[PDB]
């Protein structure tokens, strides 16, 4: 299948699996990705997602260039470009090798944490090839890179390498290709060593008020945070601190 | 007293002084901090604030874990988390050693300029210990660090060191611990070598429209800037330039 | 003339030409700059602008310190400070040598791409000399530099050098002064090797929703992007990809 | 089990009837009723045979007086008010048929409807301040958006009621009728909504409300997915065909 | 060439008259008419002799029924509605004089005016949902801002019309007159606008509308360039002089 | 010294009376009066015995005609309008009692109130454009938020007045009474406000107005500190006790 989806303990692996097309996303892959995000959001055993891709040449080069009765945003909904935005409420680590361009770059930018192989190259080549539609593949770059660096990518369509991405904090870690799966899994293990409902709430709060004035943010009541107060994990955090031991999270 | 507050010339020193609890903020310290911010805002002899902390182990590890008739946001109001937001209108330099975590990190992030000892470590361990409430301690990190680095802190609860903070421009300067007080004072001296009402106005304008579209910002009338036109310092800036001499500011 | 304006192929050169006043912008230069931006926006042969300045000492030190019947924002409108904001819809490269301060820094920050000579120094000395009016020269720095670095500039009025600007991604490239014109032209050549109407649309979309929540951005319909669908260049991009050849853009 | 009929839900043709049915408590919403309402809104949103909803209530004394004086957060009205828990949006057009007392959370609930028909016995109010209760975001925000500023404040701050005629005068309600005519009047409205193209009605509702508190220029430059999707529907083609052949369209909701 | 008179444009003193003049299509706006309207708004905005605009329409049956059932995007009404293309703002105060049917894009166009005078034959509506059409941002956003919430939704969702008296009742229209009196009533309004200081009127309009969907605190701290520029005008001085000498000001529009 | 009585301020029980008292200038607000008003609002906000304010004015001709034709910026009305200087918010509920001319900055000031009772002599307007004055953010923003769009524009752009009956019709005013009954009518309103739980009233006002120009979804997810603080008050307990014992609550404002 062109998307490989597996649940291993509390980690869901969503893996692009069409290396013969440099993992360009077909309409069928978008269907399978949408099924994955739905399951990821609905299943309380899934605490984190690793988004990855098969092969060495490319994580993802964007959409595969007819024709659908429903609007589907690129990445099974996840980009919100071309259709309704789907939000993945679990923390996500993207493991990126090789080319990560256009819609593929946008997709990686939907992740929370990004670990790149030292072969990774990021870019937005749409202007350079003369394509632009919908809202543009430009809004995440403006929020995740320094202003003039984002504009450089968006307007020239030239790529930047893993080291430069790391330098600006677009990516959290750069490793040799051989170490990419293990590195991604170390990050998922860190995310799942924290209280998973608290991690989810923190993500929802951070991102849900990111483009608002700070004062508006600070006065926001976020439902996942409200609901955390009634959880077993919340009680487990107090018990464990009171008994000077490590908490054991259950995800409820 | 657990907060030490002193006015020396045109600098107010607000110093956390409970090193035996790694400067965790008690309800009493929050009262004393609120008194400090009130005096800082109301006294025209105070042109800048240095926020610092006693001991080597930690600037501040957040709130000390009953129970109050009024809502008090952490840091005598300054964070706006847990109660009404108090804004310090004078420019503030935070001098941070050792651990700076949770609410302590948020508090440092309320400062304008941050100077860190090379022992400083910044983090938001709330998710990792299973605590989250109110709006979350997440909104300043999203505004003061690159997107994926902020998310790394918020979601894994792991710390970053002074050198990495400096690298991203979270901190303005890193010095040896022995040099921290003097470095903080150099920054307060720079702030007070500029026209102090103009500095205050600039801070109010920059921050008062920070999460708005640029066009909205550029069309804003800010009362401190309007009021600057009628000051003696404003006339002193023109006189001094006209007579090719250094201006002598009076703060009126 | 104190602004030198030339069209060479698809690049417009807008050059400040009053080196005897360190390119401080007079009311007459503001008139000439406004004429330039009007022509730049209206002429479909102009695909990119290089904003530059004569002499080695300074790109621009801001406004020249009576008195006009109309409000004119600094830089022929381009800053939107002191009058209506004029938007340059073509991609702009600023080539900055020497001092780039106050209104001159703000003006450079209106460009998309900034190439600096290794002599460049950026700063906002208004607070330090005791001047502040209108909305303040503070809003672009908050959007183009890390929060605490922006505040350092705004509040102390001290300069940063080309290497530090590059480090944070305020500037895209630093070169020796002798290489500045050629470097700026390499960037204009990259911008014009991409489809120029698509570049313009991408710029309008990125910047038109920059201070909005991401969800608002992603749901925006941008007229330049809508209009791109009906262009000859848009068809030329498909033809060229279909025939495995380089596209030849015509700007229509 | 004893509560399982405190919300009456029935689908008749293309209209869903969601009826509050605990008149003994003046239709104050219990936790059980919030569960049933959440089931109703889920079904209303998911079922493409449902083109409009009539929200109504049993008895003559009251449409709804609010919450009845849980470990999951549930906003009042099975999610619909968004007060006390996540906001649930009903994407189908809704007519509220209101008799007697419509107060507090009950009034907020009626205000979630698109069209409101009131019996001439209806009295609307927000008594929370007057009885000394206030929590969450306050039951104040819809009033500020659906009445003139000073009238909204009067309700919010005094906690006194207004009558049906005054509500109609300010265009808080669309029609006032005798209590005997209320069900039938609500059904006339639902028939009007369902005589229009139902997916277009939905898309218009999503657009109108989705940009309501934004600047007009932002609203005008919004792309709304239900509008984009409408271009690919059978009803969109049927509209053109019917106009081209000077006949009444026959909508199929697809 | 055959369309060149489908918009009648004339300047009389300080009033520009922009008159839709294709009554045979019930003043549905063709592509040619959109071109002529865009020319009109350009001239209206650029010419300092024009202090106010009356937007009107020929015939008794209809002010405008919308778009007539191109490679540049043109918003309906020569840009003025901002629906289908870039928004064109008319900076001069505008009076719409509306008779008969004022529906769809036609109603949206009237809503772009500042003052609306209606003949007692006027009927306002948004029939798009009812005929099964919806595109772009929807013709819904101005209704939500110019009518009470539930009345706006009634129009938007049912596609049924309201009459002049009901429009006047909610303050959608400023005056209702007999059809014979419509031109003259519109001119009384334009005379009132032009008896005030015209650059101040413009600046007030730009301020009011430029911050309309923002929080009040944001609005109050806005600097509006037309207001800043007004301080340097002759009319500003003439206002002070006239008040100082207890006489009527004579405005020159400079 | 000669101005020290141009604002009359008195506290009677839980009502503060802030009365403009320079009828010889038709209660145009001088710089001295702005100082006294700022003192009043400071006391009103700080004193927990004050639960409501009645803002009124001496004489029959005019409530207030605006600013009287300084090195600190002072917004008109001791800060209250936020026009010309920092905005001062009165956190206690306010009733404005308006007679005669209520124009310009005077009208803006009345619009800062929550409830407005007008004598049948009241005339409201914004004559700034008509006399050729406009500065700062414009005296236009509250009108756009408190009247129907086209009625607000009519006032703003023509500078002509409307009468009390028309203001009441659109719900700009809450009640119209004969001039002889004005003080007593204003006091009935203040009694209604103070019969509700005063800290809850305050908190409702802060919530309603604090999110008024934001999208509804933003409003609904707002945490308001006066609401959070209300949970810890004696009045909150007294409300529960009184409801539990089927008796009238006795509020203490703590």
Q: Output the DSSP codes for E113-167.
A: SSEEEEETT-EEE-THHHHT---TT-TTHHHHHHS-HHHHHHHHHH---EEHHHH
Please state, in angstroms and rounded to a whole number, the distance separating the CA atoms of residues C47 and C5.
Answer: 15
* Residue E73 Cα, gap to closest chain F Cα (Å): 29
Judge if A53 and A178 occupy the same domain: yes
D136 among known catalytic residues: no
**Is residue C171 classed as helix, strand or coil in its secondary structure?**
coil
Q: Angle of helix D198-210 relative to helix D234-244, nearest 10 degrees? A: 110
Phi/psi at A15 (5° precision): -120, 125
Neighbours of D67 (CB within 10 A): 21
Residue A70 is given by DSSP the state S
Please state, in angstroms and rounded to a whole number, the distance separating the CA atoms of residues C170 and E140.
Answer: 42
Retrieve residue F122's tokens.
């009241």
Looking up residue B15, the CATH number of its domain turns out to be 3.90.226.10
Please state, in angstroms and rounded to a whole number, the distance separating the CA atoms of residues B75 and B27.
Answer: 9
* Catalytic-role residue among F32, F43, F108, F245: F108
Of residues D171, E148, D168, D158, the one with CA closest to residue F114: D158
As to burial, measured by CB atoms within 10 angstroms (0-12 exposed, 13-18 middle, 19+ buried), residue F158 is: buried
Judge if A112 and A130 occupy the same domain: yes
Chain D residues within 8 A of C220 when measuring between CB atoms? 221-223
Residues listed for chain E: 254
Interface test with A, best of B77, B79, B155, B207 (most A CBs within 10 A): B155
Please work out, in degrees rounded to the nearest 5, the angle formed at the alpha carbon of residue A211 by the alpha carbons of A205 and A214.
70
Q: Which of C151, C168, C194 is the last residue of a domain?
A: C194
Of residues F132, D48, D103, the one with CA closest to residue E200: F132
Residue A95's beta-bridge partner residues?
A: A115
Query: Sheet containing F62-64: which strands, arranged edge to edge?
Result: F62-64, F101-103, F123-125, F162-163
DSSP secondary structure letters along B98-151: BEEETHHHHHHTTSSEEEEETT-EEE-THHHHT---TT-TTHHHHHHS-HHHHH
Neighbours of C129 (CB within 10 A): 17
* Residue D101 Cα, gap to closest chain A Cα (Å): 31
Buried b (16+ CB within 10 A) or exposed e, B172-210: bbbbeeeebbebbbebbebbbbbbbbbbbbbbbbbbbbb
Residue located via tokens 């100077």: B115
Residue located via tokens 């002899």: B45
Residues in CB range of F180: below 8 A, 6 or more apart: none
Contact B201, B224 (CB under 8 A): yes
Contact C41, C90 (CB under 8 A): yes
Of residues E89, E59, E64, E78, the one with CA closest to residue E183: E59
Chain F residues within 8 A of E172 when measuring between CB atoms? 148, 150
**Is residue B66 classed as helix, strand or coil in its secondary structure?**
coil
Dihedral angle over CA of C163, C166, C167, C172, nearest 10: -160
Question: Quick one: closest CA in B to A240, which residue?
Answer: B129
Please state, in angstroms and rounded to a whole number, the distance separating the CA atoms of residues E131 and C145.
Answer: 52
Asked if A84 lies within 8 A of D225 by C-beta distance, the reply is yes
Interface test with C, best of A138, A205, A210 (most C CBs within 10 A): A138
Counting as contact any 3 or more CB pairs under 8 A, the partners of F are A, B, D, E
As to burial, measured by CB atoms within 10 angstroms (0-12 exposed, 13-18 middle, 19+ buried), residue D183 is: middle
**Is residue E199 classed as helix, strand or coil in its secondary structure?**
helix
Please work out, in degrees rounded to the nearest 5, the angle formed at the alpha carbon of residue C148 by the alpha carbons of C143 and C154.
70
Residues in CB range of C168: below 8 A, 6 or more apart: A146, B169, C145, C146, C149
Tell me how many domains chain B contains.
Answer: 2
Please state, in angstroms and rounded to a whole number, the distance separating the CA atoms of residues B143 and B135.
Answer: 15
Judge if A131 and A214 occupy the same domain: no
Judge if E114 and E217 occupy the same domain: no
How was this structure determined? It was done by X-ray
Q: Give the B:E interface size as CB pairs under 8 Å.
A: 13
Of residues B166, B138, B133, the one with CA closest to residue B152: B138
Asked if D221 lies within 8 A of C222 by C-beta distance, the reply is yes
Contact B177, B97 (CB under 8 A): yes
Please state, in angstroms and rounded to a whole number, the distance separating the CA atoms of residues B11 and B182.
Answer: 13
As to burial, measured by CB atoms within 10 angstroms (0-12 exposed, 13-18 middle, 19+ buried), residue E91 is: middle
Chain D residues within 8 A of F196 when measuring between CB atoms? 129-130, 132, 157-159
Contact E86, E73 (CB under 8 A): yes
Contact C166, A152 (CB under 8 A): no
Retrieve residue B26's tokens.
């008690």
Contact E115, D232 (CB under 8 A): no
List alpha helices for chain A, DSSP H. Answer: 27-42, 103-108, 126-129, 139-144, 147-156, 162-167, 180-193, 196-208, 214-218, 223-228, 232-242
Q: Which of D160, D179, D196 is the last residue of a domain?
A: D196
Give me the residue from B143, B194, B219 closest to C135, CB to CB: B219
Question: Quick one: closest CA in A to C115, which residue?
Answer: A148
Judge if A101 and A208 occupy the same domain: no
**Is residue E247 classed as helix, strand or coil in its secondary structure?**
coil
Interface test with B, best of E212, E223, E227 (most B CBs within 10 A): E223
Counting as contact any 3 or more CB pairs under 8 A, the partners of B are A, C, E, F
Of residues A164, A206, A105, the one with CA closest to residue B144: A206
Judge if B239 and B156 occupy the same domain: no
* Residue E254 Cα, gap to closest chain F Cα (Å): 12
Chain C residues within 8 A of E73 when measuring between CB atoms? 223, 226-227
Retrieve residue D35's tokens.
């569960």
Looking up residue C214, the CATH number of its domain turns out to be 1.10.12.10
The CA-to-CA distance between both ends of chain B, in Å, stands at 33
Asked if C223 lies within 8 A of E136 by C-beta distance, the reply is no
Judge if A122 and A234 occupy the same domain: no
Contact F19, F56 (CB under 8 A): yes
Neighbours of D137 (CB within 10 A): 22
Phi/psi at B226 (5° precision): -55, -45
Residue located via tokens 């009954």: F181
A243 among known catalytic residues: no
* Catalytic-role residue among B67, B126, B223, B227: B126
* Residue A66 Cα, gap to closest chain B Cα (Å): 35
Please state, in angstroms and rounded to a whole number, the distance separating the CA atoms of residues F107 and F67.
Answer: 11
Domain boundaries, position A174: 1-194
Q: Give the C:E interface size as CB pairs under 8 Å.
A: 20
Neighbours of B4 (CB within 10 A): 15
Residues in CB range of D169: below 8 A, 6 or more apart: none
Residue A51 is given by DSSP the state E
* Catalytic-role residue among F32, F58, F60, F128: F128
E-assigned strand segments in chain B? 3-8, 11-16, 48-53, 58-60, 92-96, 99-101, 113-117, 121-123, 160-161, 173-175
Judge if E233 and E129 occupy the same domain: no
Asked if A221 lies within 8 A of F222 by C-beta distance, the reply is yes
Please state, in angstroms and rounded to a whole number, the distance separating the CA atoms of residues C138 and D88.
Answer: 41
Contact C53, C15 (CB under 8 A): yes
Judge if C9 and C97 occupy the same domain: yes
Q: Which of F196, F217, F242 is the last residue of a domain?
A: F196
Neighbours of B84 (CB within 10 A): 16
Overall resolution, Å: 2.1
Please work out, in degrees rounded to the nearest 5, the angle formed at the alpha carbon of residue B237 by the alpha carbons of B236 and B242.
95
Judge if E29 and E140 occupy the same domain: yes
| SS3 letters across E1-52 | CCCCCCEEEEEECCEEEEEECCHHHCCCECHHHHHHHHHHHHHHHHCCCCCE
Judge if E188 and E204 occupy the same domain: no
Retrieve residue E120's tokens.
């007692």
Contact E143, E156 (CB under 8 A): yes
Judge if A118 and A211 occupy the same domain: no
**Is residue A109 classed as helix, strand or coil in its secondary structure?**
coil
Asked if E222 lies within 8 A of B220 by C-beta distance, the reply is yes
Q: Give the A:B interface size as CB pairs under 8 Å.
A: 128
Alpha-carbon separation of residue C100 from B206, C61, C83, C88 (angstroms): 20, 6, 21, 20
What's the distance, CA D110 to chain centroid? 5
Question: Quick one: closest CA in E to D253, which residue?
Answer: E132
The CA-to-CA distance between both ends of chain A, in Å, stands at 33
E-assigned strand segments in chain C? 3-8, 11-16, 48-53, 58-60, 92-96, 99-101, 113-117, 121-123, 160-161, 173-175
**Is residue B60 classed as helix, strand or coil in its secondary structure?**
strand
Please state, in angstroms and rounded to a whole number, the distance separating the CA atoms of residues C186 and B131.
Answer: 52
Task: Spell out which chain E residues touch chain B, with contact meaning CB-CB distance below 8 angstroms.
Answer: 214, 218, 221-224
Please state, in angstroms and rounded to a whole number, the distance separating the CA atoms of residues D93 and D198.
Answer: 9
Retrieve residue F100's tokens.
């005669």
Interface test with A, best of F207, F218, F220 (most A CBs within 10 A): F218
Chain D residues within 8 A of C229 when measuring between CB atoms? none
DSSP secondary structure letters along C64-112: -----SS---TTTTTT-SSSPPP---S-EEEEE-BEEETHHHHHHTTSS
Please state, in angstroms and rounded to a whole number, the distance separating the CA atoms of residues A191 and F227.
Answer: 35
């Amino acid at each position: 299948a062109d998307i490989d989806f597996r649940i291993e303990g509390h980690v869901a692996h969503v893996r692009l699996n069409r290396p013969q097309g440099l993992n360009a996303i077909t309409q069928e892959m978008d269907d399978l990705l949408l099924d994955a995000w739905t399951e990821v959001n609905a299943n309380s055993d899934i605490w984190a997602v690793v988004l990855s891709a098969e092969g060495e040449k490319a994580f993802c080069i964007g959409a595969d260039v007819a024709e659908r009765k429903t609007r589907m945003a690129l990445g099974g909904g996840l980009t919100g470009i071309g259709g309704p935005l789907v939000t993945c409420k679990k923390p996500m680590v993207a493991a990126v090798q090789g080319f990560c361009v256009g819609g593929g770059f946008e997709l990686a930018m939907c992740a929370d944490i990004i670990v790149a192989a030292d072969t990774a190259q990021f870019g937005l080549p749409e202007t350079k090839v003369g394509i632009i539609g919908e809202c543009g593949v430009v809004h995440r770059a403006m929020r995740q890179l320094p202003y003039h660096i984002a504009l450089q990518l968006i307007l020239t369509g030239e790529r930047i390498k893993a080291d430069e991405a790391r330098h600006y904090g677009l990516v959290n870690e750069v490793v040799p290709f051989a170490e990419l799966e293990e590195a991604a899994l170390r990050w998922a293990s860190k995310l799942n060593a924290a209280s998973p409902l608290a991690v989810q709430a923190a993500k929802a709060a951070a991102l849900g008020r990111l483009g608002h004035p700070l004062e508006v943010a600070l006065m926001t009541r976020f439902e996942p945070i409200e609901e955390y107060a009634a959880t077993e994990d919340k009680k487990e955090g107090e018990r464990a601190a009171g008994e000077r031991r490590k908490p054991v999270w259950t995800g409820k």
